[PDB]
Amino acid sequence: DTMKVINDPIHGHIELHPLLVRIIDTPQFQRLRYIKQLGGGYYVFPGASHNRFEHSLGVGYLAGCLVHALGEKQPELQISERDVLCVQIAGLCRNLGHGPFSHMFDGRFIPLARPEVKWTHEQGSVMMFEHLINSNGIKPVMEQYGLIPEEDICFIKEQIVGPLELWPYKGRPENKSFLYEIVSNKRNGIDVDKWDYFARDCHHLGIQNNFDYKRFIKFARVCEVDNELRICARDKEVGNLYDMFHTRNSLHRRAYQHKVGNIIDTMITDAFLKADDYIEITGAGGKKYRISTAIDDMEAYTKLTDNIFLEILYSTDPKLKDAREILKQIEYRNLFKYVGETQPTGQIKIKREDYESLPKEVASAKPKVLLDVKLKAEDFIVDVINMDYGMQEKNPIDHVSFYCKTAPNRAIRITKNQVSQLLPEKFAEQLIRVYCKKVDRKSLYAARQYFVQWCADRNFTKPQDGDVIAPLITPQKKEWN
Amino acid sequence: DTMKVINDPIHGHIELHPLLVRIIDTPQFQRLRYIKQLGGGYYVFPGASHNRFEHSLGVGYLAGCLVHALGEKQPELQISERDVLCVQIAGLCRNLGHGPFSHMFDGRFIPLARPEVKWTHEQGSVMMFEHLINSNGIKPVMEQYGLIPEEDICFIKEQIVGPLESPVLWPYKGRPENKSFLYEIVSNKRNGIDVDKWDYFARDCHHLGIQNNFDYKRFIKFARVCEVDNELRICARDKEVGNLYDMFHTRNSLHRRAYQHKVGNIIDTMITDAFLKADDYIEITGAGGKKYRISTAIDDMEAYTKLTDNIFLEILYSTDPKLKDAREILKQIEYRNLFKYVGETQPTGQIKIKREDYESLPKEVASAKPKVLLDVKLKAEDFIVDVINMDYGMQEKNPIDHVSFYCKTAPNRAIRITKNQVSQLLPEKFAEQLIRVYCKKVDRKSLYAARQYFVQWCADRNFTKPQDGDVIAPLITPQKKEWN
Amino acid sequence: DTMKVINDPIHGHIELHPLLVRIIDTPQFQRLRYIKQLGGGYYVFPGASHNRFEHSLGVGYLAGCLVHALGEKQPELQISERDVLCVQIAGLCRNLGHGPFSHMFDGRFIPLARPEVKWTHEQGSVMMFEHLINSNGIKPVMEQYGLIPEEDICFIKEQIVGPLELWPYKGRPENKSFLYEIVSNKRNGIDVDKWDYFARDCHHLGIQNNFDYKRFIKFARVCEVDNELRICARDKEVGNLYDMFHTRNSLHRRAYQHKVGNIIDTMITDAFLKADDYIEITGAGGKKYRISTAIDDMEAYTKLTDNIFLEILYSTDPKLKDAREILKQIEYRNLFKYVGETQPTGQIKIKREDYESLPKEVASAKPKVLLDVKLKAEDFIVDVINMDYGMQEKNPIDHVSFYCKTAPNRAIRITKNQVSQLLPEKFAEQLIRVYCKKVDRKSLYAARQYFVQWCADRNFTKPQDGDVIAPLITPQKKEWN
Amino acid sequence: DTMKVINDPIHGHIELHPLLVRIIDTPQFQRLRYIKQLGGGYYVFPGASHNRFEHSLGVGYLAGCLVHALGEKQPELQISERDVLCVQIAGLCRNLGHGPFSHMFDGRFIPLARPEVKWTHEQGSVMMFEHLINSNGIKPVMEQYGLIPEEDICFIKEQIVGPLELWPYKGRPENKSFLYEIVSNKRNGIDVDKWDYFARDCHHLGIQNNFDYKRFIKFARVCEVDNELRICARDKEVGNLYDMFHTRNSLHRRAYQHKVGNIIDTMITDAFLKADDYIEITGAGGKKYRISTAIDDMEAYTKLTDNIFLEILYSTDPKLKDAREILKQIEYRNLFKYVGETQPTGQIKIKREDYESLPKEVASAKPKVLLDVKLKAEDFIVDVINMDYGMQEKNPIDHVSFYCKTAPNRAIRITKNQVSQLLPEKFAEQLIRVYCKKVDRKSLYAARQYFVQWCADRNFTKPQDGDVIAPLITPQKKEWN
Numbered sequence A, C, D: 001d002t003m004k005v006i007n008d009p010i011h012g013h014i015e016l017h018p019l020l021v022r023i024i025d026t027p028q029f030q031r032l033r034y035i036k037q038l039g040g041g042y043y044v045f046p047g048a049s050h051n052r053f054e055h056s057l058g059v060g061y062l063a064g065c066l067v068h069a070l071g072e073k074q075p076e077l078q079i080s081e082r083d084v085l086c087v088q089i090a091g092l093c094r095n096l097g098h099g100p101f102s103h104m105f106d107g108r109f110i111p112l113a114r115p116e117v118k119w120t121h122e123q124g125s126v127m128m129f130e131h132l133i134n135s136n137g138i139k140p141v142m143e144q145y146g147l148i149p150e151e152d153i154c155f156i157k158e159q160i161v162g163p164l165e166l167w168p169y170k171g172r173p174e175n176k177s178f179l180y181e182i183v184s185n186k187r188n189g190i191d192v193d194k195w196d197y198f199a200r201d202c203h204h205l206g207i208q209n210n211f212d213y214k215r216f217i218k219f220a221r222v223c224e225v226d227n228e229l230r231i232c233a234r235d236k237e238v239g240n241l242y243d244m245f246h247t248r249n250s251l252h253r254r255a256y257q258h259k260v261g262n263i264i265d266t267m268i269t270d271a272f273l274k275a276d277d278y279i280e281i282t283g284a285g286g287k288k289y290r291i292s293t294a295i296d297d298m299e300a301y302t303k304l305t306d307n308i309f310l311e312i313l314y315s316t317d318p319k320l321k322d323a324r325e326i327l328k329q330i331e332y333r334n335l336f337k338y339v340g341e342t343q344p345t346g347q348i349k350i351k352r353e354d355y356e357s358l359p360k361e362v363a364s365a366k367p368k369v370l371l372d373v374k375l376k377a378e379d380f381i382v383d384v385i386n387m388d389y390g391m392q393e394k395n396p397i398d399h400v401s402f403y404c405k406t407a408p409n410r411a412i413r414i415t416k417n418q419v420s421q422l423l424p425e426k427f428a429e430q431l432i433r434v435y436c437k438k439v440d441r442k443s444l445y446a447a448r449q450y451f452v453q454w455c456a457d458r459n460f461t462k463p464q465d466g467d468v469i470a471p472l473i474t475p476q477k478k479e480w481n
Numbered sequence B: 001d002t003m004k005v006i007n008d009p010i011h012g013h014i015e016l017h018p019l020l021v022r023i024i025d026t027p028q029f030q031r032l033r034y035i036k037q038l039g040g041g042y043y044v045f046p047g048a049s050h051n052r053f054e055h056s057l058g059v060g061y062l063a064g065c066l067v068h069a070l071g072e073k074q075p076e077l078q079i080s081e082r083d084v085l086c087v088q089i090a091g092l093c094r095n096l097g098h099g100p101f102s103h104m105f106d107g108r109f110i111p112l113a114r115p116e117v118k119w120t121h122e123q124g125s126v127m128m129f130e131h132l133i134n135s136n137g138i139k140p141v142m143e144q145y146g147l148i149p150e151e152d153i154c155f156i157k158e159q160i161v162g163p164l165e166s167p168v169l170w171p172y173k174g175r176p177e178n179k180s181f182l183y184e185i186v187s188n189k190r191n192g193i194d195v196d197k198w199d200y201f202a203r204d205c206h207h208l209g210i211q212n213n214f215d216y217k218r219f220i221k222f223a224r225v226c227e228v229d230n231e232l233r234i235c236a237r238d239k240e241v242g243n244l245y246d247m248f249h250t251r252n253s254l255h256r257r258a259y260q261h262k263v264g265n266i267i268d269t270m271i272t273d274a275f276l277k278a279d280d281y282i283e284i285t286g287a288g289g290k291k292y293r294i295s296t297a298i299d300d301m302e303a304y305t306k307l308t309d310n311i312f313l314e315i316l317y318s319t320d321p322k323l324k325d326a327r328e329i330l331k332q333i334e335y336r337n338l339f340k341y342v343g344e345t346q347p348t349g350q351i352k353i354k355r356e357d358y359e360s361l362p363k364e365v366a367s368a369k370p371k372v373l374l375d376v377k378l379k380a381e382d383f384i385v386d387v388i389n390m391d392y393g394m395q396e397k398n399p400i401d402h403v404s405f406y407c408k409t410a411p412n413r414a415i416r417i418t419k420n421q422v423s424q425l426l427p428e429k430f431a432e433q434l435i436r437v438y439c440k441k442v443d444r445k446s447l448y449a450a451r452q453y454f455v456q457w458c459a460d461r462n463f464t465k466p467q468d469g470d471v472i473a474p475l476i477t478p479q480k481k482e483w484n
């Protein structure tokens, strides 16, 4: 076994250590070739055909680039070849837990199918990783290349999911704290996973990426911060860091929360819910699982990919007829219709436990206009989207440490007002999208009247096309003019 | 209803006329989202995730660009909105006939499963198109936007597959000779210079991570229609001739580096093998509920609509013991336990290997008598021999001899340009064959032996010396004076 | 004369009508080959070798694209071939008035050399254009291609500089008002000039452009707004427009106001000031002009380019010795030293009339640190930079008209709160950079103490590296601690 | 002194060791900012504004990349930090000897101005390098960073110009032979200089580069070949090497030998020749030199750049009137007119000693056509261009060593027939361009008749537009019909 070279359109020629090759060449990893990175986004942006497999390679490559760069500038950190490989493996493997259509699965489907469970792709990635190791005899190979499985497997998992329960980590001591900031940075979100998806998603979507990760790496150093060794950025890069999160938010607005990409994800989720009683996935010992339960058996989950969509679409079983019809409407582009978008005002914050009551509220609005049709709660979809800088209401830059050119070993803090007055004043907001399942002209007209009346009643912002779609409704609200 | 805009990473914002939207929003078209452009190439080049759906949009877009550019520069050609839409539709629809893993299916699988049949993706595209039209009520929509279905449907099909009759005089019925140039946009049967190549060069390069050297926008800017032997044809500006030679050089480089990558091909081969073993057991429901097989879905478009890369996963995920052998081949692909590459050679002199002799080649390799001590003996069945025909699209011919040009001083006068009027640094031949050999036995001793047989066979047949011949078979290469 | 094709790395193959070729092939236009787009920025970003010539071709090309696209989508606007040519010519010609090192010349040099005069490159462009036309016999050529010189020359100039004093324009009537929004958009700054420089500057700087001008063009329409036909954007695109200005501000921060690029512009300006009495430029009738007076004669200004730098550097005249020495310090990279950056707080706004008093204030500060050297006012440079979204304190998106998909001919307004709470709360700010002309270690240390003490006294923001560069000074300021 | 980072649009963030910074920050190196890479090509391709300075940084960066990659893969080579710096410096400095408009100067001007001398930019680079070192106190700085000036300066020069005088090199012994193949590869032309110019020229010209230099670097190894350690490429990569030279030949054809770029170089050369007696350049000890003699004094040569073009163009001295007129014709685009192109046939090879007799031959042709004007020898320019793969008639790939995956330490040879029958059969050819100095319509018509008659008489290839430009002439030649 020697190193392999793979050619990636984002990163060029990437070298893979033979241990990494061994991990990659498994059913558990190769599974990621059948899971689209952007889910239903490929149905809106046709270049977004990329899958989680190639993203994962990229994350593993970049994790190696950052850790190598720190070691090379700062030999006194004692980064070992062992550390490098562990960080690469965590990078390669942090997407293992994703399900069909990526965020559709853990963002929409599992919360509706299994409301009692607390499932994340992160937790999935740990479980899949364990299963990958054990199923494929990876521990001896790890030993062969100088890893110590007990500690190092723990380290890899902690890099992916955080502490498995004072210094809370067991895989590495505080001396090496900075290593936990590479793959999945729990402190402020600045990690190599974002850097790959910014570049890769842009390349495929046909939108241009403004964040320069190579620059960031060149300016990164490790410094002591409150008795931990942490990654610090050069002071003057602070503007580029705000820009990084601004770029993330733009990509969410333009692509990852595109109103039609989201409705396609919703329709696919609906098909999956209707198919859940009838599709069977064979797991360990031949036992059968369903779409919603494959998360309980990694051998079954290994076989749970975007293929489920085609299995439903191509089915002839009359039990799958309702599921199959929904997917057929997607092929004909007979989609649920977008009604509009609004946002809460003031200190109003809509909680997850109130989401279900929203279609009911919309249908209870009493727009004072003549309507041909009356719509009911079940005719409406209301999608609430939390947009933020990765840390709820907090500014992630308040949780970044910097250094200055005159004293590169001294960590400092930089506040928002030390950077620019042109920066955001808030770091979290909610968008509310409404759609109608009745697609005819009269229903849609009515849906608009209810929607805008509901915005008015709730004191939400005026939809951008409010005056055009509901001219008789918007005058009543003085706050809108 | 109205135009749609689609954002494409290669071409940017592309506008689609509502008739084109209606054709796209059908099961027959959307099917192409589940067929990888490069087949098994994705298993070597991880960026090559792209599918035939997006390539088709690009071909439809570029077809519109070229036809529109000609109409704007030369109003006297009388290109109508109707002509534009027909050319866009042919562009959009010329990939409809591709099967699972694209060229794997019609290049390897169908020729082995149905040796008696003559199937091409082109023919498949015509049949799928007819089925798409009829199944989705497209004729009335065509009429609504000014098309005349009888003549225009014919035109579109002729653009994809060529003349629908044997002519052995103007062979086309969809459009008359005064519009002949319209047949050179989507699929150019005269010299291969068409918008389909231009999309795939750009798109494949973008995904593969290899850079594209051909500038199609430049070509379009310099293109004109001129009278050539009583036909109106597309002519390029004289001084672009070097760029045209370069276009075909680029196509060949892409074939060498990517589309005929030795491992991409062996993965296509292993997938084809799995499909062959699964063929008796997978059932695909077609028209009237009839069941078809992978190898027979080509006979029913309703079944073919449901035949995509999904077959690979249906096999891989199966539990039926009847699919065990097929499933086991695909599992070897996931573990990367692939057949091993032994080497590559080429014929010399006038030697040209015919398709009818392909099956006899593994037997010849196993019959070689390398004078070396061998711990294992290998048999015919242990070898795969892959013969690849590399050319400039027209067998032994120079396609540039079939291009018409114009000069700046007389833009309406068509001329010819020969190779010697361009450069002595250009290729002296336009076709060749590569021969790759692989071993199904992957252990160290088998592979060493496979190498001795292979190189001895090259020597016996008077093929070229493999590049690593002296290293892999040091005791064999000395015997051949021509190599030394 | 037929159309020429030029290959541009940003826009690809651009077609030039023969009238345009005629305008380009003149000493007045070709001059722009010898004026770097980013001035002293090339001395920081080595890829930024591009000149105003090629930018100008790109602006002309894009002005033609926008006007052609509007005409094709909306024939009812009656856009003529004549209109298209006039808009292209304005596009081609709006950079003719730039001087050596572009914004150095009209931003630093002329305001110091000719404080009494009110010079802008826009005015320069009109004067140069007039000279170009008259010197080269262009009027008959214009007539030959269907233009009417009296009106059309007026139109072109108005596009570049605005009204040459209700409807204030004479070159075209109100039914063509939208034509005035292409080349230099005085209403809200959304014009094709920015779209070319974003793309071209980024290509050359090695920074990625996030604004998609082709998308904008596809979504642009003309609609009636308060009895004028104006260019309107699709409502959906409002986020992309905020992003456009956010990109402009990023490019200013990273590149166009780079602290070292600015100080190189400042040093070149200093050399020019010291050479001004001795360099002679021959203008009309053999009269001699100076660098500072060449703006009064277009024939002399035609010969005023970046070459002046080399003429000074290569001179042997002892009268040019002091000028020549400054330029030689640039070659050895013995540059004035950056001390730091701060910003005013509260409602404090520094007025132009107070700029000259600032170095004095810095030198009057009384740090509370033992200093080897004492610095004087003349040792300090204070650069005050006004960063905004192109319209002072105003939000340019409040001056943009939009349309909705349901009524494409009805113009509407969209407020900031209808878009996002994550957008800027203010649209203008000031940055203050200080440099020291004494470059030795002890002078620099001292300069830092004065600088930070001055920040404290004035209640400016704490410099990002304040605690490192002036540890004994920052503790006194409770607001910083 | 610490490392500087510089952002390049081709290579991204490049790190420069402080010794390199010291060499860069000199009048001798900064000079290269005033010399366009592609000479007159900027007058055809407006994006080609780039200068030799930024190309030189890139060549220095890539030279470091290759040497570092070899050292990392093969520690047994004992590549030192010292070796790396020397190779970087040779890379940085190999373009120092270029003159105004790059290849114009040593390709056209010096051969005509100083026919008795033998000048190359390579020689110029060694002389300029020596001058740079001596004039700027660089030897002590080299010692400060561990170089040994005697042997290392010799090494750097040998890398640029080859042996200064069995192992012919003194700067390094045979066990480091491979180091001589990085910066200017005398054996087969595969060096980092090409790799930078391919990427950079393409970026600027707006043509796409198809050679992947990073791939090449990843597959490169050092192996023993005939008792020397040489760089070997992986066998597989042989097609990509033929493609590299094919790319080089395409770039020459499209860009570097563009027929109008060449005539602009020729017109600038003509202006320089006419100005040569009058322009004075001050060198060492105040001595005055001319454009043609500045090559004899490095202090004067330091001041010899593209600025000489503008100094002529802006001059008022009646002595410079003829020179100035030629440059003015360039601004008006009144260029010498292209008549056509042809090639010799068979084994016919035109020798340099016969170049001057060619315009006479053209004017002596007797086309049997009625002509208004008669042309003379002095009205014709005949430009003979030798196009090849860098080694005259030879195939450079016959001088490349390869290795195979099964024995990575064993060097091998690969012949053309082992690669492909679709490759070139010859590796050198000549193009002949003819132009007319009389630009009126009747002269040009006549020039075309003479030209095509001359092609017929000499048995050259039929010009591509022959039948259109000379319809009465081409019928006489049965070989063409």
Ligand SMILES: Nc1nc2c(ncn2[C@H]2C[C@H](O)[C@@H](COP(=O)(O)OP(=O)(O)OP(=O)(O)O)O2)c(=O)[nH]1
Residues within 6 Å of the ligand: A044, A045, A046, A206, A207, A254, A255, A260, B005, B006, B007, B008, C212, C215, C236, C240, C405
């Ligand atoms: N480059 C870029 N592309 C975008 C952006 N938003 C959407 N796209 C792409 C995704 C699609 O391929 C295409 C059209 O998306 P749009 O959102 O304009 O179309 P959609 O039908 O969703 O809007 P509409 O029906 O007009 O309300 O444009 C953006 O902000 N930038």
Ligand SMILES: Nc1nc2c(ncn2[C@H]2C[C@H](O)[C@@H](COP(=O)(O)OP(=O)(O)OP(=O)(O)O)O2)c(=O)[nH]1
Residues within 6 Å of the ligand: B215, B218, B239, B243, B408, C005, C006, C007, C008, D044, D045, D046, D206, D207, D254, D255, D260
């Ligand atoms: N992309 C590309 N650009 C080229 C090529 N050759 C030249 N160009 C660029 C350089 C110029 O900016 C522009 C026009 O060059 P041409 O050689 O087509 O024009 P020229 O006037 O020399 O030819 P003509 O007067 O038509 O014989 O195109 C090429 O092969 N590829």
Ligand SMILES: Nc1nc2c(ncn2[C@H]2C[C@H](O)[C@@H](COP(=O)(O)OP(=O)(O)OP(=O)(O)O)O2)c(=O)[nH]1
Residues within 6 Å of the ligand: A212, A215, A236, A240, A405, C044, C045, C046, C206, C207, C254, C255, C260, D005, D006, D007, D008
């Ligand atoms: N890509 C990118 N390049 C930048 C940015 N800011 C500056 N550059 C370029 C300009 C230079 O070629 C190179 C280094 O510039 P820097 O501003 O980092 O160095 P400078 O010496 O000004 O700062 P220092 O002395 O470290 O405080 O990077 C940026 O935000 N993005």
Ligand SMILES: Nc1ccn([C@H]2C[C@H](O)[C@@H](COP(=O)(O)OP(=O)(O)OP(=O)(O)O)O2)c(=O)n1
Residues within 6 Å of the ligand: D037, D038, D039, D041, D102, D103, D107, D121, D189, D193, D194, D197, D201, D248, D256, D257, D390
């Ligand atoms: N007639 C020419 C020859 C060269 N060049 C430019 C294009 C390349 O960017 C560079 C190549 O020549 P250099 O002097 O930089 O180096 P070489 O002469 O060594 O190039 P090569 O080795 O490829 O012959 O010069 C040019 O514009 N015109």
